[model samples]
Target: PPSSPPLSIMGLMPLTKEVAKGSIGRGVLPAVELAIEQIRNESLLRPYFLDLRLYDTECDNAKGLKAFYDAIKYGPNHLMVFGGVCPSVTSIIAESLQGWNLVQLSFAATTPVLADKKKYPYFFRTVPSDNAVNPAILKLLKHYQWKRVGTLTQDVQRFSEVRNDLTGVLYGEDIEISDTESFSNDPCTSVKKLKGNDVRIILGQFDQNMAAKVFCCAYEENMYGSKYQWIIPGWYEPSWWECLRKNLLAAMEGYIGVDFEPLSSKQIKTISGKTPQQYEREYNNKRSGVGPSKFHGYAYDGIWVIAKTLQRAMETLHASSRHQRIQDFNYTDHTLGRIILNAMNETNFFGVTGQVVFRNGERMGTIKFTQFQDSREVKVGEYNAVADTLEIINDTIRFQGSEPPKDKTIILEQLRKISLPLYSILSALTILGMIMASAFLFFNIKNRNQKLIKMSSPYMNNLIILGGMLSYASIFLFGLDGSFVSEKTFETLCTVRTWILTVGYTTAFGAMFAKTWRVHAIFKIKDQKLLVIVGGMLLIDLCILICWQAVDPLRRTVEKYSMEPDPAGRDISIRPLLEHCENTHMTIWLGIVYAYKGLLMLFGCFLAWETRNVSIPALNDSKYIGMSVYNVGIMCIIGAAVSFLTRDQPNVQFCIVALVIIFCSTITLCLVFVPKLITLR
Candidate 1:
């Protein structure tokens, strides 16, 4: 009987398409040839030759099924098949291979579904599953602190599955999926869907061809520059090499990816004893066009696994059937497939690709984080799946046009628009109010009758005017622009504003309180004693300000409550920090300040209630002062409520604060001076 021909190993790859020519298909044959030659020289199965049969699937599922059927129809003596680079095709082929009990080891298929041993009993891959890649992407997002991201995926089943898995992982990490857009073959449509989304970081779940189209569309839409960050899988690089022009490369600069390490000269030399440049010269007619495919190394390792597994299977068979001649050994039994599968599962070795070990039906290997810089991709970090961390190797991760992070820029722009107009108007109105109040005080002092002049406490009236002016003028000190006022200037303004406003408002309230107290304590507390009481009231607010400044002085903070005033503008503001006096003891101090002022107002109201029946024209006018105090108290309560409701919006909070200041000052001006002016008339 004629001895069985040498064992045949079939390779299924996407070779018919232009993109495939630069991918796994371009490298698989050469890597297989090298591995077979090496195996023949070194393995115990030296007497038997290894025959390789190559088939092109063109990356189509239907073609991959046809290719798998053709390989099976040709012979049952086939030991194993290597191929179906895409996950969709590999899955289709894997489904059929399991029924036939034929082993299919993939070099590039890394869908997480393949990890299920029950479903894919005969399926194995020399690449890590998408599960491992998901962590790497999550790690990258965490490293950059990106909370929101958009996702773009091809309409293909494999890519769709990848998108679902990736989104699940992101949800687990508490990162928001701002948008999930799918495209069939048209990248323009996908880009349009993503354009209006406010997300800065975009995760693209696409194969090489789809990635190229997406990037091309992004380039056309001006979406590939600094304001946008693209996180692409490694498979996208091959198509980028094929399609990206110099300008497009420039556009994509600073984009990031989680990719397998590129095939280096050292790796090739270690595996084949020849450099990649030399291999190209020998096998590819010296036409160096695309980057060296990492899939080539994976293919090299895949072939070696088959050869080693076959050698082990043969040795086991030979030992069990020693009576049969080695030449007449029959591998046609279904048990031979089981033996090869078991041997391959147990196979663990360091090949040209780092650590060629399969646990859970997927290869364990390192993934790298790459950033496009200066028109070339550079390694920025490494991702370790076991550690579940990304260790940054390079610290200078920045976009091409030197733009700031998209979120920060947006916030700043919004703030500028809101603060500029708001502060400008407030400052102008405050200055005008001060001038009118000063003129009113000057006229009353200059020309009032003796009885009316004596009826009013000239000093207390002047104190009220001074206090109101100081309180109103403080609003003008806040700048509209977002730029950090120098620390020295900012601190001075904060201190002056806090002290002047607190003490000024306290003094104004104290004068009103003293007048009402005088009306109630008519013959008991003299004018001098009333002055002493007012001084005591003013001193309490002054003491609080002093203690506050001594303990934790009001200091400017640019870091807190900074945000954009408009959604689409470039201006930013730290007005909330300025207005709220954000500090460790800010709330405590403010509480004490407002509490003391409220106490004075309440006491004034009580005195007015007591003296309501008194008939004196000047001293008994506590009713008006009492009403003014109540109005101010109600305004304060409304301001507090508005502040609480609009706390998240800094511009709105500042506006409420400004309105309260103006309203309270206006009320005081009307109540205090209106009666005195009427009596003079």
Candidate 2:
């Protein structure tokens, strides 16, 4: 083979960090070699052969910066670099790389801050940033309908990023953070503090070791059972030692964690032309027992991305330059780096990892949530970022011994029970009142004596009786078992109740006002003007209702008033759809409606008072009308105060409104019409 020009790609990783040795670089070097071998065998690049130079950062930022500068001393040909396991180290190296115009593609660094293209334009990651995974985690939480959750995290910079991301996502969705407990040395103490707060869902934003310690503590305290749930970030890799422990494994059962879907074993074999075991042996130069590396698939895809992008960029530049010789190409040209970046951004290929695509310099992939079960991880659900949806593969998720209660179940259980019996009695009373008023009106009309007719206008009295009957009948329209009613039916019921009561009250008050005016008239004659005044008063109410409906009509609302607390002070979420007629402007409109009615009553009272000593006994019936107006006035005053107190309590408000209407109507019935019925007899 002809001596090929060298394309040097430098990599920085935490090879000396004992904690990361098991996972970080385990398969990265092997994956890179596999990609290079494939590229060379296939002759993907005709005139250039890729060279990978690996550097150890020892998981320290200072060491990583020193390693980066040392690699830069290799000269301007080292413009493309890869590998920085820790976000902190990657950020530090990225800052200097930006100035040098070097493009650094990271296999693992997933800090949300690095996604800022303006600040870190030279940086890109194969793994999704913490910000990208935030929406997925939130979608899972929302799927389970977890509103209040406790967060457990380490007090380190990386975990702090996770904590802030989680909090910000939760806050945006209006999900409450019950408590956020951080631990430096003692996971047990942090778990204990969180346990005391009585939160069912606990989101863990710690590394594998810290997570193991926390779960071990939870095992000791029996917090791993059904009543409590533990959720961790998907990027977490569980320790083999902890999984091997029967007690710890059992404790972690039903605990959920989010992670990227691993490339299938078949896909791995097909990509490298060798099983994962074969690849490990060739890379490690020994038989491996540590299983497939968590991020090995992503690492493989990362290298292939770089190789393919470089090939495309070189080809485009050659074509644009009219087939310029590869040997004469300018290696230090900054446009080459920009072209490679643009190529990488536009590159989309199916690698060992599901799909290799980047949006805003970060890989976009599906996020899976797995639950620990039977000493192994069980796939439960997946969140597709493209679709913005969470799909549950398994429906049976046991909490404690039973399946976890769904949001709908909890809401239904917490629904406030309507006092059916009390309302039933009130409904019966209202019906009887309506029947009695109808009978009185019929009897008075049937036995129309001239004296009785002159005492009060028969036509006007009939209007009052009919309005009173409709007012009383309105109470029966509600307080039915609404559990089976459709939303439309409930809405209709609410509108019916509003119209019936409003129009009835307005009609009854208008009639009373007209009668009082007739008695106080200097020339007491049957005139059409009285009918016009009464009709005009009723017209005002109708117009107000029409305009009120145009703005925001009365409709049924299901509101979650507050969470009910148990003896332990744990919140039992009361998500009751407490049915009520909701009009945003109901308060203001009611004030206007009642103010008009109140004014009419006041005028009636004044008119009745003026005719108290009238010469004609028939006109002197103003005394009864005056007393009825005063009685209704007193009842209304008490109703307003009680309604205010019970405003938020739907059942109480319903009962109070019905009682006040019935009592006021009864007072009007007795004081005004009962005396007339006796006079007719």
Candidate 3:
């Protein structure tokens, strides 16, 4: 087997100074190897592709500059470059690469000064710069509600400048600097000599090891008095947090800070093919424990970008006469680098961290918050505000799109009562008679002089009655909003529930009015009287459903609105239905319809019993009369029982659940028993 040749693209990682000496250096290479393999095997040009290289700069600026100059000298088809991890190394390499016409992208360098698009065209970084993080730090200070602060910064060029800039932003927010101190060569001795003041909070900016050391010194000398707040750039690796946790936790009772988004569970699954804990185990098995940092994700994305661009550039130049000219496009690295950079810029990719995009055009991205929990860095929340306030809380972070938990609601409890056997029995008896009446009416419509008993059958009457009862049961099941803060209601019913309930009631009323008109047509009952009965039943049903919803314990009200326990809040939805009934003057106009339907049912049943006949139409009349009586009886029972149940259960959720079960069970049993009535007949 032949060994693969170097690709037209390469990554030059800086391994020196602060970065090289840290955990990032130790962990970065493994991630790079994994990423390279992933892209090489899975990319579009997998089998034919044959060029890639990874170089180390020793994190030295001059060394990085030399590496770039050397890459240009070697007759390699280097299309693009990924890293020279340190900002200091990048600053020189970025300048040198421009003259070489080679594009250089950084995975970890975050100095804002280098991110100036005007200063260097060939230079770009994937990680967010300090400019993105500063405002977040201020937001965090305000979030923690710190009004007084103390600053202890290494009196060095870069560190001091960062410290001053951070303080300037906070000072305007009315945060008073209670004490200010500069780092000396001997931190232990120098820290002890510092004066204590009425500082409510302490802010520190330094390297991880130095920050840990300063906290140690401060702790020993009691520089941070009891209950002091500590704020730092919330981007420490897990090991660093562990190193400082003991002293920091003791010194700073309430601490808050800001950084990039943390490694969300979904991100962990995508990158490592496992949960964060499982990844930790796998990582430890390969080398050692993993620490939390955006470096790993940045490195992963950075390498992939390099590999993809190399693949694309190679494809562009594949077997071209301008292969050398292709080499020029390839040799400079910008054309390929631009492809990768643009791909990155356009993506809302989920790496081993939260979602990220290159919105800054160069370096910065969104800022987020992290805090120390049990000696580990945990993200609490994210910020979208311009000022980027960071509210660090004790609770574990809720990931993007996750809603906060809510309290329980009242509607869920009422549904439980529907399961009662008695309700089922009543529903069955009621529906049986209505179905027979419907059949009797059908038979009579087809045959002009058909006897009432000969027209309605028991089976037909039971079907109508069952249909009406189901329609009635549907009223409560539909229309209410589903789920609480942390839960969801019915998966499919919510779709048709509201519309069905409204239409079902209106249909039932229409049928009742039609039946009343039929009575006048058959028995010559006055039309004015029939209209009055129909109007009254509509009003009654409206009042019943309204009062039932109101007394429902689970029913949430707007007076006590909450996103969690009750998503519906306190708005009563069925007011329009009642108002519709009221405006139609149905209360005064519907009684005649009800009276006609009732009297027709009684007359039909009595005539069937008197004739002692078994015709389909006559049997239908008897069934309709029985079912109608049952429908009116069960409706009254439900109204009374539900009103009683509402008063009994102060906790509406329990009541609603109980009522729903009761209602469903009752209807099921009614269907079963009502069909048995047909068997008996």
The clash numbers for all candidates, in the given order, read 14, 4, 93
lDDT of each: 0.65, 0.67, 0.50
lDDT of 2 by residue, 243-282 (tens): 2367776776777777667653332544445565565456
Clashes of 1: 14
* Candidate with the larger TM-score of 2 and 3: 2
Superposed by TM-score, candidate 1 places the C-alpha of residue 362 at a distance from the truth, in angstroms, of 2.5
The total of clashing pairs for model 3 equals 93
Compare candidates 2 and 3 on lDDT and give the better one: 2
By TM-score, the better pick of 1 and 2 is 1
What local lDDT does model 2 show for residue 317?
33
Cand. 3 TM to true fold: 0.45
Instruction: In model 1, state the lDDT of residue 341.
Output: 79
Query: Cα miss at 244, model 2 (Å)?
Result: 17
lDDT of 1 at 208: 73
Lowest-sum lDDT 10-residue window in model 3: 572-581
lDDT of 1 at 560: 45
RMSD of each: 9.9, 9.9, 22.0
Quote the positional error of residue 509 for candidate 2 in Å.
Answer: 28
Candidate 1: tens digits of C-alpha lDDT, residues 1-681: 124456667777766547644365665466456556666666445455667777778766687678767866775456567776765777666777655557777767666677678877788887775566877777666666766767777777666877777666655567666677676777686577667655567777677756556667777777755667877776553336655576566676677777665443233444446555664455454235633555666676677677667667777645656323333534445665677677877787655554567776777777766776675666776765654556675455766666445542333222232475776787777777777797787877787557776666677778878888888887756543355433356556677767777777877767766765654565533557756775776677667767777855754443444342443344333333333345554355566667766776666667665666566464446666655767778888788677766645666666778888888887667556777778778
**Top TM-score: which candidate number?**
1
- Compared with the true structure, what per-residue lDDT tens digits does model 3 show for residues 394-414? 557432224321211133321
